[PDB]
Amino acid sequence: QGLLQDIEKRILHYKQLFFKEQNEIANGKRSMVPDNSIPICSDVTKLNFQALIDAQMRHAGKMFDVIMMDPPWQLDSLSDEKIQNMPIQSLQQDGFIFVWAINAKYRVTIKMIENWGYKLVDEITWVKKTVKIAKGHGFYLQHAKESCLIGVKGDVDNGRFKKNIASDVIFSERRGQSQKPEEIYQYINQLCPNGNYLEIFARRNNLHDNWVSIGNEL
């Protein structure tokens, strides 16, 4: 293979990328992260939500117009009871909530939001384009989509939230999964623009402007 010199060549070449990246970082290399996101790395079991409530009330008049969820249902394996127990009720007072329900937990999710005081009103459908179908092995029917359950509480009569703006159906590719479609945040914009948002169990991919993001991998 004549491959001692080979291996010595990949090493000196690889180190210069490190010596390059760390210097650009020192020179202000930007992140993909937008500059207005508020990432928080915590464990929702160990996190104190009064700190988030005090701080948001403090620097904002308001509370959250939208909440997004993608719970780590155990089938990162968070106890079912534990998720139900998060004080979501206190995090938001008037507005919408979004939560992604895998087929296994669709009924449980509905029970969950209803428990937290929301009224189920709508569901987003995300089909997974081959690029145009999705093959997933259902127990009873194959799965070509996951769904976003939408609950509402309070006065949305305000112009703050705009009705009849957005779709039920999203058509994105199965980017990098487990990863949701970006055009969720586009839809949330349409539904309520320039608003205070919250995402729980977020990942670095999720971070967007205006969004408070909580996830243990941030």
Binding site: L12, K15, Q16, F18, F19, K20, E21, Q22, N23, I25, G28, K29, R30, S31, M32, V33, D35, N36, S37, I38, P39, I40, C41, A51, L52, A55, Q56, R58, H59, A60, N194, R204, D209, N210, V212, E217, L218
Partner: protein, 129 residues
């Protein structure tokens, strides 16, 4: 009528973990360009510089215990040590205990040398083999 820039910064300070945001409130992109729990704190940067002074270069098992109590990858250490000495081959320096005072001197000597030699890439001197 709300400024989300300020809002983020204020929120970020109270809520955001230390390494996420700067002391002024804004978020530091250094954190987000390094995966997971791999970001390199300026506080353990002085720890590598302190271990080269006490134990010497290539002593990483020796220096791993003291200043990086369990894990930093020893590949990383030798990679940052060639950052400290301004050279991409750190072979020459191995086993020598080098003061922070010296390290700084070596770095400005290898960098000026490589710039005259025109063998400087990314503020690191490229050593021939």
């Amino acid at each position: 009528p709300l400024d989300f820039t300020q809002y983020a910064k204020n929120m970020r300070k109270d809520l955001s973990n230390q390494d996420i945001c700067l002391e002024d409130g804004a978020l530091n992109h250094s954190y987000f360009l390094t995966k997971k729990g791999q970001y390199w704190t300026p506080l353990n940067q002085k720890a590598l510089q302190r271990g080269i002074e006490l134990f010497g270069v290539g002593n990483w098992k020796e220096i791993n215990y003291d200043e990086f109590s369990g894990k930093a990858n020893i590949v990383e250490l030798e990679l940052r040590t060639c950052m400290i000495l301004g050279i991409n081959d750190i072979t020459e320096y191995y086993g020598k205990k080098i003061s922070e005072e010296e390290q700084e001197e070596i770095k400005k000597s290898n960098i000026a040398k490589g710039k005259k030699e025109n063998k400087l890439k990314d503020n690191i001197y490229q050593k021939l083999q």
